[PDB]
Design an enzyme around this catalytic site. Structure first.
Site, PDB file in Angstrom:
ATOM      1  N   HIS A   1      26.559  42.910  20.256  1.00 10.64           N
ATOM      2  CA  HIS A   1      27.500  42.407  21.276  1.00 10.64           C
ATOM      3  C   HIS A   1      28.711  41.818  20.550  1.00 10.64           C
ATOM      4  O   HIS A   1      29.375  40.878  21.063  1.00 10.64           O
ATOM      5  CB  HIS A   1      26.844  41.389  22.218  1.00 10.64           C
TER       6      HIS A   1
ATOM      7  N   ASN B   1      22.000  41.468  30.608  1.00 10.07           N
ATOM      8  CA  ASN B   1      22.647  42.789  30.366  1.00 10.07           C
ATOM      9  C   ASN B   1      22.869  43.459  31.735  1.00 10.07           C
ATOM     10  O   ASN B   1      22.524  42.914  32.771  1.00 10.07           O
ATOM     11  CB  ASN B   1      21.737  43.729  29.524  1.00 10.07           C
TER      12      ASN B   1
ATOM     13  N   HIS C   1      22.622  31.380  24.151  1.00  8.64           N
ATOM     14  CA  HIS C   1      21.260  31.596  23.659  1.00  8.64           C
ATOM     15  C   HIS C   1      20.227  31.323  24.837  1.00  8.64           C
ATOM     16  O   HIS C   1      20.296  30.259  25.475  1.00  8.64           O
ATOM     17  CB  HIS C   1      21.036  30.660  22.457  1.00  8.64           C
TER      18      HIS C   1
ATOM     19  N   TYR D   1      18.510  33.319  18.437  1.00  9.12           N
ATOM     20  CA  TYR D   1      19.856  32.882  18.864  1.00  9.12           C
ATOM     21  C   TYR D   1      20.240  31.529  18.268  1.00  9.12           C
ATOM     22  O   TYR D   1      21.408  31.222  18.194  1.00  9.12           O
ATOM     23  CB  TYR D   1      20.016  32.837  20.399  1.00  9.12           C
TER      24      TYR D   1
HETATM   25  C1  HDD Z   1      14.815  39.055  18.481  1.00  8.80           C
HETATM   26  C2  HDD Z   1      16.058  39.550  18.460  1.00  8.80           C
HETATM   27  C3  HDD Z   1      16.885  39.707  19.766  1.00  8.80           C
HETATM   28  C4  HDD Z   1      16.506  40.485  20.769  1.00  8.80           C
HETATM   29  C5  HDD Z   1      15.033  40.955  20.938  1.00  8.80           C
HETATM   30  C6  HDD Z   1      17.440  40.290  21.867  1.00  8.80           C
HETATM   31  N1  HDD Z   1      18.508  39.586  21.360  1.00  8.80           N
HETATM   32 FE1  HDD Z   1      20.255  39.374  22.426  1.00  8.80          FE
HETATM   33  N2  HDD Z   1      21.161  38.619  20.536  1.00  8.80           N
HETATM   34  C7  HDD Z   1      20.479  38.307  19.367  1.00  8.80           C
HETATM   35  C8  HDD Z   1      19.105  38.530  19.192  1.00  8.80           C
HETATM   36  C9  HDD Z   1      18.249  39.231  20.042  1.00  8.80           C
HETATM   37  C10 HDD Z   1      21.438  37.726  18.431  1.00  8.80           C
HETATM   38  C11 HDD Z   1      21.519  38.628  17.161  1.00  8.80           C
HETATM   39  O1  HDD Z   1      21.086  36.376  17.977  1.00  8.80           O
HETATM   40  C12 HDD Z   1      22.799  37.706  19.147  1.00  8.80           C
HETATM   41  C13 HDD Z   1      23.990  38.384  18.445  1.00  8.80           C
HETATM   42  C14 HDD Z   1      24.667  37.194  17.789  1.00  8.80           C
HETATM   43  C15 HDD Z   1      24.369  36.068  18.749  1.00  8.80           C
HETATM   44  O2  HDD Z   1      24.921  34.946  18.790  1.00  8.80           O
HETATM   45  O3  HDD Z   1      23.217  36.404  19.363  1.00  8.80           O
HETATM   46  C16 HDD Z   1      22.508  38.310  20.443  1.00  8.80           C
HETATM   47  C17 HDD Z   1      23.417  38.525  21.465  1.00  8.80           C
HETATM   48  C18 HDD Z   1      23.201  38.898  22.778  1.00  8.80           C
HETATM   49  C19 HDD Z   1      24.226  38.890  23.808  1.00  8.80           C
HETATM   50  C20 HDD Z   1      25.708  38.507  23.598  1.00  8.80           C
HETATM   51  C21 HDD Z   1      25.971  37.029  23.960  1.00  8.80           C
HETATM   52  C22 HDD Z   1      27.446  36.833  23.749  1.00  8.80           C
HETATM   53  O4  HDD Z   1      28.219  37.328  24.619  1.00  8.80           O
HETATM   54  O5  HDD Z   1      27.835  36.220  22.709  1.00  8.80           O
HETATM   55  C23 HDD Z   1      23.678  39.295  24.965  1.00  8.80           C
HETATM   56  C24 HDD Z   1      24.390  39.442  26.330  1.00  8.80           C
HETATM   57  C25 HDD Z   1      22.274  39.547  24.739  1.00  8.80           C
HETATM   58  N3  HDD Z   1      22.019  39.285  23.396  1.00  8.80           N
HETATM   59  C26 HDD Z   1      21.362  39.972  25.687  1.00  8.80           C
HETATM   60  C27 HDD Z   1      20.103  40.439  25.371  1.00  8.80           C
HETATM   61  C28 HDD Z   1      19.200  41.200  26.211  1.00  8.80           C
HETATM   62  C29 HDD Z   1      19.426  41.662  27.677  1.00  8.80           C
HETATM   63  C30 HDD Z   1      18.096  41.426  25.503  1.00  8.80           C
HETATM   64  C31 HDD Z   1      16.859  42.203  26.027  1.00  8.80           C
HETATM   65  C32 HDD Z   1      16.349  41.941  27.254  1.00  8.80           C
HETATM   66  C33 HDD Z   1      18.240  40.825  24.188  1.00  8.80           C
HETATM   67  N4  HDD Z   1      19.473  40.204  24.163  1.00  8.80           N
HETATM   68  C34 HDD Z   1      17.319  40.835  23.146  1.00  8.80           C
END
Ligand code: HDD
Ligand code: HDD
Lengths: 726, 726
Positions: B101, B174, B365, B388
């Protein structure tokens, strides 16, 4: 979960044409391609086959599919250290992209001089035509992020790291011979103006917006490099088909201590070639990775990118002999005044193994010079020297960036510097200072001398007061822009006009468009009128009376400034689309493929679905892509062999393929019944220059097509394209 | 003093439609639009007008055009601290982008519930219909970098930070109700597979490559969210016209301690609407910032994005009453089985001031919950809770990211945590530990309670052994893909077929295509046959014999899963291209423009050049953009008013405009002589559904056009477009 039984998961480790095999890491694709730098990375290259999956601590993992939980529908447990290591590493994968030139593509290769240059420089890498110097080269755009598109209109970067026996030399250049601005202090102003605007972070990969044209209209020093950016130089066909330039005047210093001024040039041996704007733009959508892909595939095919290093040399006593200042980086040195001397050849012959490790982490910096070179007082170069060291502290995490494998010298490095984040080198020296007696003062300073000497600056005379002041000799802004304009062919001029017209049409505040047009009127009134017309602006009587700037040292034009005025076509490594039908005449295809192979021109076979078609003689033809999947944008010319033409005659995508290629001035060749397509692009029965036609694809048909391809595009067609709806 | 004396450099501080004024920082555009969070940011907002330019240490700068040098052509001096500060800050502007994202566009707004939800949750923000909660929302793509294109085919993120009186609640969702994988341990495998491939870093912003389809072919749990991504869901028209979902089952906890399972929904009040693929892909090239731009301008125009928050609620005793597991995030809850209950409305009504400071640094988060909410054992959600928090340590430079202004709670925060990089808060507490007597044990723990209580987890029973084991209840992969497929209209189904065909056609290893086809044969044979035909692949008798997966709890479809099956059109905020000529019939334009204004639809007046044209009656018509500058990709419909059609009838761009609009199924209206364009698009004399035509734009012309617009696209046109070359 395994490989197919046929071994088709794994590409051949042999040179192969684009599309024939999946692409792969350099050391697996070309394991026998070696150079000193490639070999020295072997301590850190990590394989995979036959190895157990582990944590970073070396512990084998039994189940890499599941987290540890209390029951199989239960909560995840904090003691799952395998999950947290894996997630922690994923969570921290990203590093800050470069401030500028974030988007780039890199490869390994080697350099050698044609003859010893010891008369003019003691630089070791230029001392012997049989001493090979490994290189790592990164090409780039400037404005966009690391995930922006390739074929934007922008300056391109062309950075070469030379791993010499007397230290790393980085020649950090661009694809035009000047820069937008005169003094490094204005760099953040210029770059903030071209970059996405700060309230909304729009637009990516484009100067076509208010802030940039605002800064330009108010800083006429920028107009020279802007002319180059609005010309087709701003949208090259490939990184293999553009020039490179160091932009600044540097010095060469010989054994005897003589200084000679020098400007650096890279000449593309595949020739100069650029896209057209509708094609480049549409291509950032169809394939934002086009230049990255094309560079990687050329190397995998054996079409190694080659460049000739050349020097413009100016004796010290000639410093003041032109009507511009040699130290002003907005001014070029016309080749008609000072010729480029051939110096050596660089060949890029292997792709990296891991883009992030080798490409993203590479640090280039023009202060990384070697004995036999030196700087000048160019006020843009002077400030660059501060930045390229400074920016690596955040981008690469600290001051041990030279220990990241790609960055390491292949020659000895020893000194008393210690510690820093992620310190790899374990120093055994009893001393971390000098002078020291406890290690008998080692490592020791080395006097300067003819070869293997210490670095000593050229003892240039400095006389002046401490001032923040632009040299008066820099205060001239129009005559180099005008020399560039007059040196372009009429169709190159038309495309410059179209670039300014298109960009300024996207400037919301109309007074900024007006002010830019007033600056154009100080360069060339024909140019200014042609841009004004497109903007619905009318020049004033005063504007129409502006005296054009002077010629550059008597020159009315210099054809070396043009991409196309002097032919330098090379068709090797170019690509053709061949539009298939379900009953291809195999005799046509035979001849087509044989002529292309003879010139090293690649082919991609296209159809309306994937899979195979069978030719008239039972030959099974595999399909590379659909007409929509690989548009005419991605190829240099289009051939349609005879066969069952009815199969594709009313296919919209096939017809459009030809209309797009026609619009973009590419050669088209039609054999036998494929001539029925002449109606789609409105070719008269007599035919026309740039459309090849015959009863079949024979010797003559291919020779014709190949001759057009050597001329790159069919410029005489331009009057015929504005009527076609494509 | 460089501003134009007429004041036209400054956009009006009043709502204005897209293109009418330059865009601005939200606090300069809409200074009277306020909420408690926007107000609390005032301590850090920095103005500029009337202020002296200084270093960061507050020292006035005299000459910001030059470095300090010895002589005006001399070397730059190390004592130039003004140069070094300014270049240093520039050299370190970048921070790591989000791991996923990375590409996102954001805005301020507020949320209010319709009524108190006290009976089912003690969450303070849902307790009172008069309680307004400020929010900050970021919408995003998933795969591409921060500099990648907006209208790629991908999942979209929809993240909402609620600044509540009892803490920050982040609803991180999402635009589809499920995710690709079941257990967080596989998130780096899935993400690595979809992201650019590691040798060459290609492709950007696309799943259309080998490693993604390799992983999908080997992990059938992926297939449900893959179906969503391959449908027109993967290419929304706007962030205002997609659904949002939390995906996971969470819990609501009321005052009495009862838990209810909940899944979160956002309904777009502007309806559901998507692009078509060829349009979407081409738009990544003509405007890679289209969604970012459209969001910003909707807000500047007053067309505020509005969403209704809804809950699917399931009593505890019903946990095991579905054919699928509630904790399985690859499964959706069909609205026919569990309706969405309307909870409240969110309105986004102000853009940020500085994109980097507010959007790039924002940290969302899903572990940021508040009393009255809680988690479940969903093993994807469970691993998210770890990531997060961890990821911000590098991304935002340490553990004080909550002190970055956009991230701060608006409610009190006090604890014993101290220090860390970038510490803003200056703690005066004599104690930095508890229990303490030296500050009378303050700040103190708070027991849980009906309101303003401490957080206590719902005391859910855990029973099991410590296992890394997938629940067998999760081992069903096909029935949800099939339910989704069966719920789509026929044109939607065709678009799904084309999305798979197009993507697999970019997969270089054929065996991977074949394995994907075989998986599809487990979902629905019609789908699988149609994708196989496009790939030149023949299903085996075994494949033709695979028995379909079961219905989902007796459902053979659910129309809530379709973008278009149940009409929810809204034209307000949409836009129309108006193609001008040099003598427009002014009565037509009056009728057209006023009809559009009355329904909140915007217009852009287009021509072959910028500036002005004059109507029949002498009215002067300002031109917004050229045909090529503002392509039909960027509008929802096209209107050609009558006049001197000969002016544009031969203009290739004018013609192509209509052909592109036509191909992409958009309403087109033609008045008087503009009907001569009928021949360009191959319309029959007696006309067709989706083309509005009349002698003039009076009477029912504008109503007929607006009706088409309310239905979004002309799906009935689909069989016509395959043969047109555009
Ligand atoms: C275990 C790892 C993990 C998994 C399984 C998920 N996420 Fe996530 N997500 C992260 C680890 C992560 C992250 C890498 O920590 C991010 C990118 C950098 C951030 O700050 O968070 C992130 C970002 C992130 C963002 C962007 C937030 C923003 O605008 O800054 C969204 C909208 C989602 N996620 C949504 C989801 C959805 C709908 C998931 C499944 C239902 C999901 N995430 C699973
Ligand atoms: C004083 C500031 C400054 C100015 C005046 C220049 N540069 Fe620069 N350049 C940087 C500061 C910088 C930088 C910010 O340090 C970059 C991006 C971050 C870094 O690693 O280097 C960079 C990167 C960078 C790259 C990309 C290297 C790579 O691929 O990693 C190239 C090719 C150039 N520069 C070339 C030029 C040219 C031809 C200039 C004008 C003749 C020029 N730079 C002026």
């Amino acid at each position: 979960s395994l490989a197919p039984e046929d071994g088709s998961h794994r590409p051949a480790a042999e040179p192969t044409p684009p599309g024939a095999q999946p692409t792969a890491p350099g050391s697996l694709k070309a394991p026998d391609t070696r150079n000193e730098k490639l070999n020295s990375l072997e301590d850190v290259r990590k394989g995979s086959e036959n190895y157990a999956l582990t944590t970073n601590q070396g512990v084998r993992i039994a189940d890499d599919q599941n987290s540890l939980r209390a029951g199989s529908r239960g909560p995840t447990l904090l003691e799952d250290f395998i999950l947290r290591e894996k997630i922690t590493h994923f969570d921290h994968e990203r590093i800050p992209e470069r401030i500028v030139h974030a988007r780039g593509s890199a490869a390994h290769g080697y350099f050698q001089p044609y003859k010893s240059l010891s008369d003019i420089t003691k630089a070791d890498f230029l001392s012997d035509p049989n001493k090979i110097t490994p290189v790592f080269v990164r090409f780039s755009t400037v404005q966009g992020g690391a995930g922006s598109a390739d074929t934007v209109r922008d300056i391109r970067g062309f950075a070469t790291k030379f791993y010499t026996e007397e230290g790393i030399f980085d020649l950090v250049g661009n694809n035009t011979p000047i820069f937008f601005i005169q003094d490094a202090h204005k760099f953040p102003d210029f770059v903030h103006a071209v970059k996405p605007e700060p309230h909304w972070a729009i637009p990516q990969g484009q100067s076509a917006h208010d802030t940039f044209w605002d800064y330009v209209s108010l800083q006429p020093e920028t107009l020279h490099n802007v002319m180059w950016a609005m010309s087709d130089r701003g949208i090259p066909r490939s990184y293999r088909t553009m020039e490179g330039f160091g932009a600044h005047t540097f010095r060469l210093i010989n054994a005897e201590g003589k200084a000679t001024f020098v400007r650096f040039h890279w000449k593309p041996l595949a020739g100069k070639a650029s896209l057209v704007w509708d094609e480049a733009q549409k291509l950032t959508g169809r394939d934002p990775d086009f230049h990255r892909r094309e560079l990687w595939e050329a190397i995998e095919a054996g079409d190694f990118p080659e460049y000739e290093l050349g020097f413009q040399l100016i004796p010290e006593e000639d410093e003041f002999k032109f009507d511009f200042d040699l130290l002003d980086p907005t001014k070029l040195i016309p080749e008609e005044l000072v010729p480029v001397q051939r110096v050596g050849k660089m060949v890029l012959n292997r792709n990296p193994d891991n883009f992030f490790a080798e490409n993203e982490q590479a640090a280039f910096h023009p202060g990384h010079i070697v004995p036999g070179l030196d700087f000048t007082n160019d006020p843009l170069l002077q400030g660059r020297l501060f930045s390229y060291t400074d920016t690596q502290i955040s981008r690469l995490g600290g001051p041990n960036f030279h220990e990241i494998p790609i960055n390491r010298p292949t020659c000895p490095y020893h000194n008393f510097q210690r510690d820093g984040m992620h310190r790899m080198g374990i120093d055994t020296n009893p001393a971390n200072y000098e002078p020291n007696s406890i290690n008998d003062n080692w490592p020791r300073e080395t006097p300067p001398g003819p070869k293997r000497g210490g670095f000593e600056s050229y003892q240039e005379r400095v006389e002046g007061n401490k001032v923040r002041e632009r040299s008066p000799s820099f205060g001239e802004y129009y005559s180099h822009p005008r020399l560039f304009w007059l040196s372009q062919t009429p169709f190159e001029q038309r495309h410059i006009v179209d670039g300014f017209s298109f960009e300024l049409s996207k400037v919301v505040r109309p007074y900024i468009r007006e002010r830019v047009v007033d600056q154009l009127a100080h360069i060339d009134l024909t140019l200014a009128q042609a841009v004004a017309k497109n903007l619905g602006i009318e020049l004033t009587d005063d504007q129409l009376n502006i005296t054009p700037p002077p010629d550059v040292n008597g020159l009315k034009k210099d054809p070396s400034l043009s991409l196309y005025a002097i032919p330098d076509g090379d068709v090797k490594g170019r690509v053709v689309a061949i539009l298939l039908n379900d009953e291809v005449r195999s005799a046509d295809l035979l001849a087509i493929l044989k002529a292309l192979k003879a010139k090293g021109v690649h082919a991609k076979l296209l159809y309306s679905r994937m899979g195979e078609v069978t030719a008239d003689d039972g030959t099974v033809l595999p399909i590379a892509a659909t007409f929509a999947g690989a548009p005419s944008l991605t190829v240099d010319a289009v051939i349609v062999p005879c066969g069952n033409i009815a199969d594709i005659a009313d296919n919209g995508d096939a017809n459009y393929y030809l209309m797009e290629a026609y619009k973009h001035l590419k050669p088209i060749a039609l054999a036998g019944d494929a001539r029925k397509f002449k109606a789609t692009i409105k070719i008269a029965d007599q035919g026309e220059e740039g459309i090849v036609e015959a009863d079949s694809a024979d010797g003559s048909f291919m020779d014709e097509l190949l001759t057009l391809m050597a001329a790159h595009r069919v410029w005489s067609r331009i009057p015929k394209i504005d009527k076609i709806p494509a």
